[PDB]
């Protein structure tokens, strides 16, 4: 039965992990996957998380199944974090949230939901973008179209090209927007641009789908959600796939959420029942631990205070490494100017390397990055920054 | 976009949870979902699990993503538990295991894998059976056919009817067998019958798929895996979806495994790469906590000893409640003899109630069971047994 199965192609992002595993060279530098590293090159468990896990260990009395949609408190806190503590969406009970195994899992649930319950046939994603998007929607049977987004020479959002591309998207089409910290460009719309996109979306009849995996890494928790909120204010329906993998450092616990919004409470409840049906035939119910940690932290004033500071520290260390990266690059002999890196939000550096240069960085210098030229700045430390820049200058 | 979505039908098993939620009557009895209850009507966290979680809290230094297939140790221990510590499948590297979000999640991964990578078009499941099977495979685009299994009057496995039904299954068809503790009948093939099925399977060219969610609840860990092992000895290829939800009381942590077996190491590795591709476009990587607990317990002699005893205690309490149930039924005036219940393995009682009787038990007595007439014996306690039997006698 399996004699003729073909070897699947490696994942352009997750496949780096396997290569790093093989390479036995002493000082290889991992700047691939978007995971936070501290000054010591370690991906630590947040202190707030350790405290929450301590609390769970002493108070948990059962591991009996959660409902299909997960921890009710978790969904409440997620909606507040997304739409604002006193939002109308919450007051009018227009939103329902299902806890999912990571943001990726949330995207898969959204995809199965749309494919089976609506007339949607196309999903629009940005280019450059995040490869997993095309893969997930395609697997659900939806075709993926791309819309321009980046001005490769000025290193800014090409708003005009964006609007021109999206004009080809018809009513009923899904349009996927990155909530903040666009992966991989790190260039996000200004509030005024978000507002224009929100209005344009309503008029064209698009169904906005937001991928929100970096809330808090651009400017702040609330500020980073202003684009989404601009949309939520004018739209009757929308979908949000969010993740706590990065802002809580809970990567491997798979903590995400798929939030569905409808015109009214009656409609969202009917639609949500179908979303639950899509979950039932997938993994049945979500994993408790990760989400339990999140709900505990977000519902406890003390733990929340600690967590918000840790998030702020992560954001600040990254922004600090960006400056050092640029500075070290100049004092190392870089013939090209990478100052444009400073404008980029999130964990990545993007736009200055070709796929050949990335290959050479790996083969000759043991430096690992994504073929698109995306480097994880969050993986840069004061210790590996010197050899890192010397290698880059060598391939420029 | 969502104006015309239809309300999804409730799940015949998981939907009971919602009804129990609504019913505000004081002493309702939950005998629905197959979850273990102790003598106090509580679903406790095993002591071995608490100890493992304690260990993780103190030694975990990161929550960085696990690989697509999960914790390597977890897969090793799962293969030993299934095929035997020194099995040839393991020696010959003919098996690969992916950690999954529960046994259900494993079934979904198996389904997506088969649908996209093989010529399989049909999956055969027993009737009576477990409703989730049809739902999951159907969602993956595979048609489900049923094969006879139960002798409703003698309350035994109708081996002849089973073989007659399966004769309609053609080479290339998948045949799903419950590893032990058949849900819901509780009637399993004897070792001799398993051996006959194993031989018949090889000759007809079926691809066996085992759903193993109750290893340890029939007779014992090793004994319960003899059927699967009989198959593994004669088959070149097979699939096993196992779960740790019940034997570890880790329900909500979603701890499962999908094991793939091929003729050789080369073939299984190629096929497994495609299974990983099916996972990547679903939830990406599995949740760490639950599986970490399992690997810690199974790899530590002391913790394992404790866990095996707790499992033995659960099995024994259930078997004890079966006797009491039958006895209390007789001394309560039951006009019918339910002694056949004693032969049934696992957590359920099946075969003596109609769907109307179950409805009346709910409406009039607050007793909840599945419409098929399946009652969770593991939910019976010395405290609720009296009112439970009085209600049953009333509807007989
Ligand atoms: C990290 C990320 C996600 C979700 O990751 P999970 O690990 O599945 O929670 C989704 N989209 C983008 C663009 C991301 O960077
Ligand atoms: C419990 C069970 C499963 C798997 O349950 P999970 O909670 O998904 O691990 C699968 N099949 C049967 C027949 C079961 O009883």
Tab-separated table of N, CA and C in Angstrom, chain A residues 161-247:
chain	number	residue	atom	x	y	z
A	161	UNK	N	0.366	49.441	-4.643
A	161	UNK	CA	0.387	48.117	-5.258
A	161	UNK	C	-0.550	47.165	-4.513
A	162	UNK	N	-0.677	47.357	-3.205
A	162	UNK	CA	-1.550	46.508	-2.400
A	162	UNK	C	-2.989	46.678	-2.881
A	163	UNK	N	-3.448	47.924	-2.912
A	163	UNK	CA	-4.804	48.243	-3.349
A	163	UNK	C	-5.083	47.799	-4.782
A	164	UNK	N	-4.090	47.929	-5.658
A	164	UNK	CA	-4.266	47.537	-7.053
A	164	UNK	C	-4.449	46.031	-7.182
A	165	UNK	N	-3.682	45.276	-6.400
A	165	UNK	CA	-3.766	43.820	-6.418
A	165	UNK	C	-5.102	43.354	-5.859
A	166	UNK	N	-5.497	43.926	-4.724
A	166	UNK	CA	-6.749	43.550	-4.072
A	166	UNK	C	-8.001	43.899	-4.859
A	167	UNK	N	-7.861	44.732	-5.883
A	167	UNK	CA	-9.010	45.103	-6.694
A	167	UNK	C	-9.506	43.907	-7.494
A	168	UNK	N	-8.665	42.884	-7.598
A	168	UNK	CA	-9.019	41.675	-8.334
A	168	UNK	C	-9.778	40.683	-7.444
A	169	UNK	N	-9.850	40.982	-6.149
A	169	UNK	CA	-10.555	40.126	-5.200
A	169	UNK	C	-12.034	40.479	-5.212
A	170	UNK	N	-12.878	39.488	-5.467
A	170	UNK	CA	-14.318	39.709	-5.542
A	170	UNK	C	-15.052	39.490	-4.229
A	171	UNK	N	-16.262	40.032	-4.143
A	171	UNK	CA	-17.075	39.886	-2.945
A	171	UNK	C	-17.183	38.403	-2.609
A	172	UNK	N	-17.030	38.066	-1.333
A	172	UNK	CA	-17.113	36.671	-0.938
A	172	UNK	C	-15.749	36.029	-0.780
A	173	UNK	N	-14.714	36.725	-1.244
A	173	UNK	CA	-13.341	36.247	-1.135
A	173	UNK	C	-12.811	36.548	0.259
A	174	UNK	N	-11.927	35.690	0.747
A	174	UNK	CA	-11.324	35.919	2.039
A	174	UNK	C	-10.001	36.642	1.818
A	175	UNK	N	-9.728	37.625	2.665
A	175	UNK	CA	-8.485	38.375	2.573
A	175	UNK	C	-7.780	38.239	3.915
A	176	UNK	N	-6.575	37.681	3.884
A	176	UNK	CA	-5.811	37.461	5.101
A	176	UNK	C	-4.815	38.572	5.388
A	177	UNK	N	-4.969	39.184	6.557
A	177	UNK	CA	-4.092	40.254	7.006
A	177	UNK	C	-3.333	39.798	8.246
A	178	UNK	N	-2.073	40.206	8.345
A	178	UNK	CA	-1.268	39.907	9.518
A	178	UNK	C	-1.639	41.047	10.471
A	179	UNK	N	-2.007	40.717	11.705
A	179	UNK	CA	-2.417	41.728	12.671
A	179	UNK	C	-1.391	42.798	12.988
A	180	UNK	N	-0.140	42.371	13.121
A	180	UNK	CA	0.972	43.268	13.399
A	180	UNK	C	2.224	42.437	13.155
A	181	UNK	N	3.383	43.083	13.083
A	181	UNK	CA	4.629	42.356	12.839
A	181	UNK	C	4.488	41.431	11.637
A	182	UNK	N	4.156	42.014	10.489
A	182	UNK	CA	4.002	41.246	9.259
A	182	UNK	C	5.198	40.304	9.061
A	183	UNK	N	4.903	39.034	8.805
A	183	UNK	CA	5.918	38.007	8.602
A	183	UNK	C	6.014	37.785	7.097
A	184	UNK	N	7.205	38.001	6.506
A	184	UNK	CA	8.474	38.417	7.110
A	184	UNK	C	8.927	39.879	7.057
A	185	UNK	N	8.224	40.732	6.321
A	185	UNK	CA	8.672	42.113	6.163
A	185	UNK	C	8.786	43.001	7.405
A	186	UNK	N	7.940	42.775	8.404
A	186	UNK	CA	8.002	43.599	9.597
A	186	UNK	C	7.449	44.996	9.361
A	187	UNK	N	6.826	45.198	8.206
A	187	UNK	CA	6.239	46.486	7.856
A	187	UNK	C	4.721	46.371	7.991
A	188	UNK	N	4.127	47.193	8.847
A	188	UNK	CA	2.678	47.153	9.056
A	188	UNK	C	1.973	48.431	8.602
A	189	UNK	N	0.678	48.328	8.273
A	189	UNK	CA	-0.040	49.530	7.843
A	189	UNK	C	-0.119	50.506	9.010
A	190	UNK	N	-0.203	51.796	8.711
A	190	UNK	CA	-0.342	52.789	9.768
A	190	UNK	C	-1.831	52.703	10.091
A	191	UNK	N	-2.267	53.349	11.164
A	191	UNK	CA	-3.678	53.302	11.531
A	191	UNK	C	-4.553	53.871	10.417
A	192	UNK	N	-4.056	54.896	9.732
A	192	UNK	CA	-4.814	55.506	8.644
A	192	UNK	C	-4.974	54.545	7.480
A	193	UNK	N	-3.945	53.746	7.211
A	193	UNK	CA	-4.013	52.781	6.118
A	193	UNK	C	-4.966	51.638	6.476
A	194	UNK	N	-4.944	51.225	7.741
A	194	UNK	CA	-5.824	50.168	8.229
A	194	UNK	C	-7.261	50.642	8.035
A	195	UNK	N	-7.515	51.893	8.410
A	195	UNK	CA	-8.848	52.467	8.282
A	195	UNK	C	-9.309	52.492	6.838
A	196	UNK	N	-8.392	52.780	5.926
A	196	UNK	CA	-8.757	52.812	4.522
A	196	UNK	C	-9.049	51.391	4.052
A	197	UNK	N	-8.246	50.431	4.509
A	197	UNK	CA	-8.445	49.039	4.126
A	197	UNK	C	-9.767	48.526	4.701
A	198	UNK	N	-10.095	48.960	5.913
A	198	UNK	CA	-11.335	48.531	6.553
A	198	UNK	C	-12.532	48.973	5.724
A	199	UNK	N	-12.508	50.226	5.275
A	199	UNK	CA	-13.600	50.772	4.470
A	199	UNK	C	-13.674	50.097	3.119
A	200	UNK	N	-12.519	49.916	2.492
A	200	UNK	CA	-12.469	49.278	1.189
A	200	UNK	C	-13.013	47.853	1.285
A	201	UNK	N	-12.648	47.159	2.360
A	201	UNK	CA	-13.087	45.786	2.582
A	201	UNK	C	-14.613	45.704	2.639
A	202	UNK	N	-15.223	46.570	3.440
A	202	UNK	CA	-16.678	46.601	3.568
A	202	UNK	C	-17.351	46.798	2.206
A	203	UNK	N	-16.847	47.753	1.428
A	203	UNK	CA	-17.398	48.048	0.107
A	203	UNK	C	-17.238	46.936	-0.927
A	204	UNK	N	-16.133	46.198	-0.861
A	204	UNK	CA	-15.881	45.117	-1.814
A	204	UNK	C	-16.518	43.804	-1.354
A	205	UNK	N	-16.934	43.758	-0.094
A	205	UNK	CA	-17.554	42.553	0.428
A	205	UNK	C	-16.577	41.427	0.728
A	206	UNK	N	-15.377	41.766	1.181
A	206	UNK	CA	-14.399	40.744	1.514
A	206	UNK	C	-14.688	40.256	2.928
A	207	UNK	N	-14.219	39.053	3.240
A	207	UNK	CA	-14.370	38.480	4.576
A	207	UNK	C	-12.956	38.528	5.136
A	208	UNK	N	-12.683	39.472	6.045
A	208	UNK	CA	-11.337	39.576	6.615
A	208	UNK	C	-11.000	38.431	7.570
A	209	UNK	N	-9.782	37.920	7.451
A	209	UNK	CA	-9.306	36.861	8.329
A	209	UNK	C	-7.972	37.382	8.856
A	210	UNK	N	-7.873	37.562	10.167
A	210	UNK	CA	-6.638	38.072	10.741
A	210	UNK	C	-5.787	36.989	11.386
A	211	UNK	N	-4.498	36.987	11.059
A	211	UNK	CA	-3.556	36.049	11.656
A	211	UNK	C	-2.842	36.973	12.643
A	212	UNK	N	-3.024	36.708	13.927
A	212	UNK	CA	-2.472	37.546	14.990
A	212	UNK	C	-1.559	36.716	15.894
A	213	UNK	N	-0.291	36.592	15.514
A	213	UNK	CA	0.630	35.795	16.300
A	213	UNK	C	1.651	36.597	17.091
A	214	UNK	N	1.687	37.911	16.900
A	214	UNK	CA	2.674	38.735	17.598
A	214	UNK	C	2.123	39.929	18.367
A	215	UNK	N	0.910	39.815	18.894
A	215	UNK	CA	0.347	40.930	19.638
A	215	UNK	C	1.293	41.285	20.777
A	216	UNK	N	1.740	42.536	20.807
A	216	UNK	CA	2.642	42.974	21.858
A	216	UNK	C	4.086	43.177	21.431
A	217	UNK	N	4.471	42.611	20.286
A	217	UNK	CA	5.844	42.727	19.792
A	217	UNK	C	6.138	43.931	18.896
A	218	UNK	N	5.116	44.694	18.524
A	218	UNK	CA	5.341	45.852	17.676
A	218	UNK	C	5.526	47.098	18.548
A	219	UNK	N	4.447	47.533	19.188
A	219	UNK	CA	4.494	48.700	20.062
A	219	UNK	C	3.968	48.333	21.445
A	220	UNK	N	2.821	47.663	21.472
A	220	UNK	CA	2.218	47.256	22.728
A	220	UNK	C	0.960	46.430	22.507
A	221	UNK	N	0.495	45.761	23.558
A	221	UNK	CA	-0.706	44.935	23.477
A	221	UNK	C	-1.893	45.639	22.837
A	222	UNK	N	-2.254	46.800	23.374
A	222	UNK	CA	-3.396	47.548	22.861
A	222	UNK	C	-3.126	48.197	21.507
A	223	UNK	N	-1.971	48.841	21.375
A	223	UNK	CA	-1.611	49.504	20.126
A	223	UNK	C	-1.576	48.527	18.953
A	224	UNK	N	-1.029	47.339	19.189
A	224	UNK	CA	-0.910	46.323	18.146
A	224	UNK	C	-2.241	45.788	17.651
A	225	UNK	N	-3.303	46.014	18.414
A	225	UNK	CA	-4.619	45.532	18.020
A	225	UNK	C	-5.500	46.617	17.405
A	226	UNK	N	-4.947	47.802	17.158
A	226	UNK	CA	-5.765	48.879	16.600
A	226	UNK	C	-6.227	48.643	15.168
A	227	UNK	N	-5.431	47.924	14.384
A	227	UNK	CA	-5.827	47.645	13.016
A	227	UNK	C	-7.037	46.727	13.044
A	228	UNK	N	-6.905	45.614	13.759
A	228	UNK	CA	-7.988	44.647	13.897
A	228	UNK	C	-9.252	45.351	14.395
A	229	UNK	N	-9.087	46.193	15.408
A	229	UNK	CA	-10.207	46.922	15.985
A	229	UNK	C	-10.859	47.877	15.001
A	230	UNK	N	-10.073	48.431	14.081
A	230	UNK	CA	-10.623	49.335	13.080
A	230	UNK	C	-11.541	48.512	12.194
A	231	UNK	N	-11.121	47.286	11.898
A	231	UNK	CA	-11.921	46.394	11.071
A	231	UNK	C	-13.182	45.944	11.802
A	232	UNK	N	-13.028	45.535	13.058
A	232	UNK	CA	-14.147	45.061	13.866
A	232	UNK	C	-15.242	46.105	14.039
A	233	UNK	N	-14.875	47.371	13.891
A	233	UNK	CA	-15.828	48.455	14.055
A	233	UNK	C	-16.756	48.625	12.863
A	234	UNK	N	-16.289	48.250	11.678
A	234	UNK	CA	-17.096	48.405	10.471
A	234	UNK	C	-17.617	47.110	9.860
A	235	UNK	N	-17.075	45.982	10.294
A	235	UNK	CA	-17.494	44.704	9.744
A	235	UNK	C	-18.549	43.971	10.551
A	236	UNK	N	-19.430	43.292	9.831
A	236	UNK	CA	-20.489	42.516	10.447
A	236	UNK	C	-19.933	41.118	10.762
A	237	UNK	N	-18.990	40.667	9.938
A	237	UNK	CA	-18.398	39.348	10.099
A	237	UNK	C	-16.888	39.350	9.880
A	238	UNK	N	-16.181	38.547	10.668
A	238	UNK	CA	-14.743	38.436	10.522
A	238	UNK	C	-14.228	37.237	11.300
A	239	UNK	N	-12.979	36.874	11.041
A	239	UNK	CA	-12.373	35.729	11.702
A	239	UNK	C	-10.978	36.100	12.178
A	240	UNK	N	-10.630	35.656	13.382
A	240	UNK	CA	-9.325	35.938	13.949
A	240	UNK	C	-8.661	34.670	14.472
A	241	UNK	N	-7.482	34.365	13.937
A	241	UNK	CA	-6.708	33.212	14.374
A	241	UNK	C	-5.557	33.837	15.141
A	242	UNK	N	-5.542	33.650	16.453
A	242	UNK	CA	-4.484	34.228	17.264
A	242	UNK	C	-3.639	33.146	17.915
A	243	UNK	N	-2.460	33.542	18.373
A	243	UNK	CA	-1.531	32.617	18.993
A	243	UNK	C	-0.863	33.199	20.222
A	244	UNK	N	-0.570	32.331	21.177
A	244	UNK	CA	0.102	32.735	22.394
A	244	UNK	C	1.490	32.098	22.435
A	245	UNK	N	1.875	31.452	21.338
A	245	UNK	CA	3.181	30.797	21.250
A	245	UNK	C	4.338	31.758	21.524
A	246	UNK	N	4.309	32.924	20.880
A	246	UNK	CA	5.379	33.896	21.037
A	246	UNK	C	5.254	34.855	22.227
A	247	UNK	N	4.100	35.496	22.405
A	247	UNK	CA	3.982	36.426	23.526
A	247	UNK	C	3.965	35.773	24.913
